[PDB]
Design an enzyme around this catalytic site. Structure first.
Site, PDB file in Angstrom:
ATOM      1  N   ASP A  81      32.363  -5.093  -5.729  1.00 34.70           N
ATOM      2  CA  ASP A  81      31.791  -6.431  -5.592  1.00 34.70           C
ATOM      3  C   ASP A  81      31.365  -6.707  -4.146  1.00 34.70           C
ATOM      4  OD1 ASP A  81      31.078  -9.049  -5.790  1.00 34.70           O
ATOM      5  OD2 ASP A  81      33.123  -9.835  -6.035  1.00 34.70           O
ATOM      6  N   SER A 133      14.435 -12.862   1.167  1.00 35.79           N
ATOM      7  CA  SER A 133      13.301 -12.268   0.482  1.00 35.79           C
ATOM      8  C   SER A 133      12.011 -12.956   0.916  1.00 35.79           C
ATOM      9  CB  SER A 133      13.500 -12.387  -1.028  1.00 35.79           C
ATOM     10  OG  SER A 133      12.348 -11.998  -1.746  1.00 35.79           O
TER      11      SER A 133
END
EC number: 3.4.23.22
Length: 330
Positions: free
Chosen positions: A35, A199
């Site tokens: 994770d 992004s």
């Protein structure tokens, strides 16, 4: 040194991925959920409340000759999905894919929430976010990666998750045969303890690319792709019959639909998520309403590039002095 381990989807939907991890001496192999959105290595154990164990493999520290109780240390964690676990702490030897760390904090669960009990395939979590998020008290502990880093050939690990198929986590090297083209690297902020990056935009299907900054985290422990409501609405508008359902808890779509791809930007590069990756199947057994793999982050407080996004790429978690993230197509 290096390590390399195969990671395997837990079910036919790729809801999560498990990776075998050797703990203790002799080795006890547990299948852990790696994770990159948390920083605790915790396991089901011989200390876990009996009624809260249902099929998981447990770590038994008393059978490990290298286990040592970390005196006074406790831990307690709550995840974004509302699940939680807590307990005490041992140090022991932990190996992943041939890479060994001695003195790793292994957090032994005394209690786990129902979602963990109900998932027989996940024996615990191995956190790979920054150690500043580790919950051990009163002395915070380091992640497996943080402990291994100095010994690694290069201070990196890579995630290569499969779509409906196994993939790989590598530590200490970049497998140049595992991706196509070049790896595009992008800046990371560690201010929230996550692999947080921005992004450069998105496209829906064959549509034009929208240049827009989307701050979010690269999170292998989250199944879906959570993005701003504007982006998510634009995606699902291209699927006839799709709608946001408050009763189901997100966007659903007719199972008869063919889903468009979703592209996200990494600098000037583009990662394409095929439409099929966005299908999470019937909302309930036998239903013709299917759950979407792109959902709104509104009210999460952060955008999350979970497995839906990451499995479309070869992803480099560069833990150099100034960390960065790399993405390549594959």
């Amino acid at each position: 040194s290096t390590g390399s381990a195969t990671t395997t989807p837990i079910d036919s939907l790729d809801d999560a991925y498990i990776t075998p991890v050797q703990i203790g001496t002799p080795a006890q192999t547990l299948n852990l959920d790696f994770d990159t959105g948390s920083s605790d290595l915790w396991v089901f154990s011989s200390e876990t409340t009996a009624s809260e164990v249902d099929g998981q493999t447990i770590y038994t520290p008393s059978k490990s000759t290298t286990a040592k109780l970390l005196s006074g240390a406790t831990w307690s964690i709550s995840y974004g999905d509302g699940s939680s676990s807590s307990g005490d702490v041992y140090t022991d030897t932990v190996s992943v894919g041939g890479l060994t760390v001695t003195g790793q904090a292994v957090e032994s669960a005394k209690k786990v929430s129902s979602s963990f009990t109900e998932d027989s395939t996940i024996d615990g979590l191995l956190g790979l976010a920054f150690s500043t998020l580790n919950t051990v008290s009163p002395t915070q502990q380091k992640t497996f990666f943080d402990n291994a880093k100095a010994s690694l050939d290069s201070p990196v690990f890579t995630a290569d998750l499969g779509y409906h198929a196994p993939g790989t986590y590598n530590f200490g090297f970049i497998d140049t045969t595992a991706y196509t083209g070049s790896i595009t690297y992008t800046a990371v902020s560690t201010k929230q303890g996550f692999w947080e990056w921005t992004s450069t935009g998105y496209a829906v299907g064959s549509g034009t690319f929208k240049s827009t900054s989307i701050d979010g985290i690269a999170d292998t422990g989250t199944t879906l792709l959570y993005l701003p409501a504007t982006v998510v609405s634009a995606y699902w508008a291209q699927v006839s019959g799709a709608k946001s359902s408050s009763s189901v808890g997100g966007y659903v779509f007719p199972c008869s639909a063919t889903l468009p791809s979703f592209t996200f930007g990494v600098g000037s590069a583009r990662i394409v998520i095929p439409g099929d990756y966005i299908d999470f199947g019937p909302i309930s057994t036998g239903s013709s309403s299917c759950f979407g793999g792109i959902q709104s982050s509104a009210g999460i407080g952060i955008n999350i590039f979970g497995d839906v996004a990451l499995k479309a790429a070869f992803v480099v978690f560069n833990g150099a002095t100034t960390p960065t993230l790399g993405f390549a197509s594959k």
